[PDB]
Design a protein around this ligand. Structure first.
Ligand SMILES: Nc1ncnc2c1ncn2[C@@H]1O[C@H](COP(=O)(O)OP(=O)(O)OP(=O)(O)O)[C@@H](O)[C@H]1O
Ligand SMILES: Nc1ncnc2c1ncn2[C@@H]1O[C@H](COP(=O)(O)OP(=O)(O)OP(=O)(O)O)[C@@H](O)[C@H]1O
Lengths: 719, 80, 80
């Protein structure tokens, strides 16, 4: 309500009445407060609203002293009985003045005004007009809130979020502030660590009296930026506002501590002493200041400056552990429950902190956790129309809503959603279910939270051309991501010694390009989870196969700009026809014992064991024999009709056994795989169709048939 | 009219929204339908109104795509 | 990369290209705005066609816009 100055003047009125042995407090006693001290600096006495306004301060001094003598000496017990309506009114008027003046606290000037407005000399011995405008002019020309927010006062008024763990850097802050020379601690570190949280923590220590007196009484402020630049128009007015503030904090008011969150706001512009320097210049005069900066910003300015370094103490701020993070979540739990009017489970705070670590490589634990909590609470606030925050489902869903990470979906229809991948993928991918199982296994591990967080599932598919290696990877991208083309197939065979940035390797800054690994690294960074496939890894230069070791184990991914992604939540497929020489032995459609060792033998002799050692499993896919392609032919024809834009006509697909057989016998070979089937259907079925379409004769529906080879029908509806 | 009705709904003047949601909006819809009938083919001509090209999927759009990208497939010409 | 602040101060929202079917729905939603501006009529199949053609022939401009270019341009062709 009141400034410390206003409280001082009022308090003095009261205590002077006690000291002078006076009964009820009168306007006289507040006037006594005004003339309480010889200090000229006291506006109520010499550098006055009276003296620099319209009248001799002595006129007023004698009004008051005459009156103080005039009031008779009382028993000490009533010496200050009450402010009564008289001082009640003055203080209330001071509040009316705040409203008129738009002042957040009662100023000693509001007391000077309100008293003067009500008052009149009570005796003929002295006379003076209440020159309201003169006293306002002088008040307005005298005396940080114009340039900063009083963080301490906000803290006194609550409006503050408590901290945990960071007490140690706060204690360090206090210890630095307590220093005689380098009085300025600075909070340096990653964004999101809690450096603002620390400065609020500092405000709490001030508020809570946990700070030695020399800092205990400090008034903490949020500085500059707006005051610094928004308040600017011309050369030198930065320095003017600076100097103004600095002077204010230099004197009288115990101490004021300024806080600078983003020091980068200073440092001039290539320095040039573009205002900023004044603070360092005057910094020797105690000027207790707390600052902060991102470690990389620190870097970008410490490298240039050197001056501020002698003014401040560098303080690294540690990131809290997951458990410590939970503690902050718990500390802020009531803030969140209040924020949205919802309950949150303690277990939610816990899972959020742990899961957040797993989820967000681009967020510090306190951000990632507070994000899940505030996001979840916000999510629930929408659900207020129906709820509260659930440790499992709410956290899982909001995380998934934002990052996809389907492993947290935990769908109620798990039968389709993973259990029957053997059936779903077999239908899409005809062939050994074992290849399918290798993938579904990985997927099931990811959903169950079992997949080792340090090993993105990865498989090496050994086969023949036309085997369906890529097909499987695309179909699982279909099943899992609802998009067969979501995946990034990779041209690893197309790889020599230059293989940098066009590949996952990215590019080095200082060299042309600040865009890197577009196809892989940037897209891998962009997609929260994914599918990655390597085409013909056996043909890739070994130096990249070596680079791949980085993410084959660990899942860690680092770019040429030094950025890290770490896609351990992705699945990787490597393909090769390396073992084709032994797969082609035909020793079982599914390669049998001994032969499989030769297939893998080629792999073992060719690739460094290190490559191989990091694969979740190396899988040999069965040749898709003629009896099996039978199914893919019917399936493929279905897909082919479905791919033809709008379904206006399209086939009845009467292959008859003869075209089923022609396709099976002509479009397939154990040494070419299934590839020629697609070529064959298109070469004959679609080409003949094209002729009927080309002529623009087809009217409705189309038919597949044979001539005894493959041959289409013509409709009775056309020529 | 829909924008006006909708505004009335967001203004919580639903009754005036109703003034249009009922009768006026569907009347205009019907006027449109009547106009299409006037446009529609006549025994004397393949469309009463010759200038309306009715942006044809092929004659206008597959043709446009070809004008922009060449892609001769979408010409769909009798020159085959 | 250069920022590190705004980076943390907002939610990343990946915006995927709509499917062709969604694109057609978009084109349908906008059909009257094209017809009104240009003073033309279009076929529903034209909308279908533009979405499909764009998917097939304009792989550097994402659907909604690409398909709309075909629609707008086609309509302009007709308006002229
Ligand atoms: N002990 C704590 N650790 C971390 N965050 C905390 C803590 N206590 C409260 N918080 C809340 O978490 C956030 C910490 O953000 P803070 O501003 O300190 O990050 P920062 O280190 O300043 O980086 P930035 O410049 O991106 O804000 C604040 O929004 C604060 O309310
Ligand atoms: N298991 C299968 N189920 C269904 N269709 C298959 C299957 N295997 C192969 N095909 C057909 O053959 C092709 C799959 O081949 P894929 O893209 O995997 O080539 P590949 O096996 O990787 O050989 P490459 O190494 O020369 O790319 C598809 O066009 C598909 O129609």
């Amino acid at each position: 309500q009141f400034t410390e100055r206003a409280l001082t003047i009022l308090t003095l009125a009261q205590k002077l009445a006690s000291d002078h042995q006076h009964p009820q407090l009168q306007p006289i006693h507040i006037l006594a407060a005004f003339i309480e001290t010889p200090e000229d600096g006291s506006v109520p006495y010499l550098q006055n609203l009276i003296e620099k306004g319209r009248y001799d301060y002595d006129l007023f001094k004698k009004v008051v002293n005459r009156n103080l003598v005039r009031i008779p000496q009382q028993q000490p017990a009533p010496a200050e009985i009450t402010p009564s309506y008289a001082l009640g009114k003055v203080l209330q008027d001071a509040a009316k003045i705040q409203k008129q003046q738009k002042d957040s606290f009662i100023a000693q000037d509001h007391i000077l005004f309100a008293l003067f407005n009500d008052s009149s000399i009570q005796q003929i011995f002295k006379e003076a007009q209440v020159d309201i405008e003169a006293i306002k002019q002088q008040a307005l020309e005298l005396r940080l809130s114009k340039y900063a927010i009083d963080m301490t006062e906000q803290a006194r008024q609550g409006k503050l979020d408590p901290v945990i763990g960071r007490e140690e850097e706060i204690r360090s802050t206090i210890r630095v502030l307590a220093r005689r020379i380098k009085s300025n601690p600075c909070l340096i570190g990653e964004p999101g660590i809690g450096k603002t949280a620390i400065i609020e923590g500092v405000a709490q220590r001030i508020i809570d009296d946990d700070v030695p007196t020399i800092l205990q009484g400090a008034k903490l402020f949020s500085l500059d930026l707006a005051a610094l630049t928004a308040g600017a128009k011309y050369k030198g007015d930065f320095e003017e506002r600076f100097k103004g503030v600095l002077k204010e904090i230099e004197e009288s008011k115990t101490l004021i501590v300024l806080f600078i969150d983003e020091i980068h706001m200073l440092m001039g512009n290539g320095k040039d002493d573009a205002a900023n320097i004044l603070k360092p210049a005057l910094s020797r005069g105690q000027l207790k200041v707390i600052g902060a900066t991102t470690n990389n910003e620190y870097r970008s300015i410490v490298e240039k400056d050197g001056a501020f370094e002698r003014r401040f103490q560098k303080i690294e701020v540690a990131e809290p552990s997951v458990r410590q993070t939970v503690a902050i979540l718990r500390g802020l739990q009531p803030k969140y429950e209040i924020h949205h009017g919802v309950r949150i489970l303690d277990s939610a705070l816990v899972t959020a902190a742990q899961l957040a670590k797993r989820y967000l490589p681009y967020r510090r634990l306190p951000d990632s956790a507070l994000d899940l909590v505030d996001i979840s609470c916000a999510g629930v606030a929408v659900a207020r129309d129906s709820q509260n925050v659930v440790d499992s489902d709410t956290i899982s869903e909001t995380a998934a809503r934002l990052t996809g990470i389907p492993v947290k979906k935990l769908s109620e229809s798990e039968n389709e959603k993973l259990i029957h991948m053997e059936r779903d993928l077999s239908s899409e991918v005809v062939g050994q279910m074992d290849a399918i199982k290798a993938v579904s296994n990985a997927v099931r591990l990811s959903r169950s939270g079992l997949a080792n967080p340090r090993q993105p599932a990865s498989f090496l598919f050994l086969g023949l051309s036309g085997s369906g290696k890529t097909e499987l990877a695309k179909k699982v991208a279909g099943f899992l991501f609802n998009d067969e083309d979501m995946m990034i197939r990779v041209d690893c065979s197309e790889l020599s010694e230059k293989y940098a940035v066009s590949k996952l390797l990215g590019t080095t800054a200082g060299y042309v390009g600040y865009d890197e690994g577009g196809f892989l690294t940037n897209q891998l960074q962009y997609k929260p989870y994914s599918v990655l496939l390597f085409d013909e890894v056996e043909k890739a230069h070994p130096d990249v196969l070596t680079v791949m070791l980085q993410m084959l184990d660990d899942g860690r991914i680092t770019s040429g700009q030094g950025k890290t992604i770490d896609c351990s939540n992705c699945i990787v497929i490597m393909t090769s026809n390396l073992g084709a020489e032994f797969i082609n032995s035909q020793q079982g459609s599914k390669i049998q014992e001994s032969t499989k060792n030769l297939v893998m033998g080629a792999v073992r002799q060719h690739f460094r064991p290190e490559f191989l050692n990091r694969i979740s499993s190396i899988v040999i896919f069965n040749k898709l024999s003629r009896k099996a392609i039978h199914k893919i032919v019917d399936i493929r024809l279905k897909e082919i009709e479905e791919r033809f834009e709008q379904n206006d006509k399209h086939y009845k697909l009467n292959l008859t056994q003869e075209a089923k057989d022609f396709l099976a016998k002509y479009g397939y070979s154990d040494d070419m795989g299934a590839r020629p089937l697609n070529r064959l259907i298109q070469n004959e079925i679609l080409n003949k169709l094209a002729l009927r379409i080309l002529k623009n004769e087809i009217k409705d529906k189309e038919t597949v048939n044979v001539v005894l080879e493959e041959c289409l029908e013509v409709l009775p509806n056309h020529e | 009219l829909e924008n006006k009705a909708l505004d009335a709904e967001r203004r919580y003047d639903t009754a005036t929204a109703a003034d249009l949601r009922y009768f006026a909006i569907p009347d205009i819809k019907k006027q449109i339908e009547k106009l299409e009938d006037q446009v529609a083919e006549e025994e004397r001509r393949a469309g009463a109104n010759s200038m309306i090209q009715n942006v044809v999927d092929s004659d206008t759009i597959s043709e446009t795509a070809a004008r922009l990208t060449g892609i001769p497939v979408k010409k769909l010409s009798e020159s085959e």
